[PDB]
Amino acid sequence: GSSGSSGMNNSGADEIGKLFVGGLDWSTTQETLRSYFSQYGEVVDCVIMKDKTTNQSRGFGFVKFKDPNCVGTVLASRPHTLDGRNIDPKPCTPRGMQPSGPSSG
């Protein structure tokens, strides 16, 4: 970059095969959520954050994938929308770029 400062590139094997879904719906459940993402990649672990008292899906969660490649496949299928709710997955990584490359299908 010329003006903006991007910085160096790091890998750090952490939250690679993880997928942070942003934009869930109080109705959205972990069961259905699993399959919804399972169609893309073998869901290993699905989590859906809920309220403290209401215990309702605030509007975000997580999704694990047997393979760290499954995450991308979905990131390319974006945007996303499950249970009549506009959602958007994330590689669970900080802003910036990655040397990953065109690696995708």
Can you read off the two tokens belonging to residue 69?
A: 């490649």
On whether residue 38 sits in a domain, the answer given is yes
Nearest Cα neighbor of 57 from 87, 92, 29 is 29
Q: Is residue 83 part of a domain?
A: yes
Within a domain: 9: no
Question: Per the domain annotation, does 97 fall within a domain?
Answer: no
Q: Is residue 37 a contact partner of residue 63, using CB atoms and an 8 Å limit?
A: yes
Give the phi and the psi of residue 20 in degrees, each rounded to 5: -90, 110
Q: How far is CA 63 from CA 5, 52, 73, in A?
A: 31, 21, 13
User: What is the Cα 92 distance to its own chain's centre?
Assistant: 6
Domain that holds residue 85: 16-89
Instruction: Determine, yes or no, domain membership for 43.
Output: yes
Examine residue 102 and state whether it is found in any structural domain, yes or no. no
CATH value at residue 85: 3.30.70.330
Q: Which two tokens stand for residue 7?
A: 């910085």
Number of domains in the chain: 1
H-helix or E-strand spanning residue 59: strand 57-65
Method: NMR
> What is the pairing mode between strands 80-82 and 85-87?
antiparallel
Residues paired with residue 48 on neighbouring β-strands, in sequence order: 61
